[PDB]
Protein: Iron(III) ABC transporter, periplasmic iron-compound-binding protein
Amino acid sequence: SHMEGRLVVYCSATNAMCEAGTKAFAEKYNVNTSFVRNGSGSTLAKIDAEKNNPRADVWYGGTLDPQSQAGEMDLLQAYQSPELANIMEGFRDPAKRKGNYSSAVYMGILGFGVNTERLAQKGIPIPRCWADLTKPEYKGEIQISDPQSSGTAYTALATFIQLWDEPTAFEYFKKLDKNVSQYTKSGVTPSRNSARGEVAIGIGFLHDYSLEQAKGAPLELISPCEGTGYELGGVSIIKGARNLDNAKLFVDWVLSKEGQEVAWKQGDSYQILTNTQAEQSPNALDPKTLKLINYDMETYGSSDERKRLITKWVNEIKM
Ligand SMILES: O=P(O)(O)OC[C@H]1O[C@H](O)[C@H](O)[C@@H](O)[C@@H]1O
Structure:
């Protein structure tokens, strides 16, 4: 019968990570825990819509930029976990509005995955650069997500501006658009469809491609030639949370060694962990071995930039 209260989680990681994380939390603390999974941008919209009568306690996973925007928008309540002492320097309080309205639970590398069987069958060379993806031979063979609803897609747009500049990122996207077969509402979906061979190339976070590989899909991960970007996975307590103590406990736990290791050991989710005492997945990428930009979480997690960039992308690129 009686348990130790409730926790309602709006999750934006994969369903597998969401399920493994909330299950392990629930079983440890005997908390009646539920979750729903939605894209990072979709989740922001939901929390904004529900702000007068909040339905969830915590927002777990997904990219940090929408969570940073929420903090700026007074949709979150700040909570500084003791566990932050164990979080890698530089990642302890990374959002636009400081004071840990949001905290960083993982790091994911942006890139693309390539179905080598499909390209080989079609006599199409494997691409290795972002710039390759605009070439004639990839028309109809690319899937990417939509930054209106997906955190991944916004991370990509932000990464192209930081690799290059804003006009050439948008010029890039105009050319890329001609080759896109589908814009997906969540970030993981291109990994699923490139794995099954419906399209040859998915743009997204590389650990989702590692998982598909591990399941037998003929995928090859590419960290592209020009360099690339990354997400921080966020955790945030929702302002007006009904179950506030269990929310704080959840934040403490998912920032801990124990909570983070559940993601790859039980949730099949191979992001880089931000806790300095956590065992890293042998399947995780090592950032020091990659050409990474220094992603400006503060500017791209600013509300005016999110809205300006996403509006410009819908207007100029998607139409
Ligand atoms: O792009 P979204 O739907 O917002 O999801 C973003 C999330 O998607 C993936 O599938 C990754 O496993 C997560 O590392 C990422 O944070």
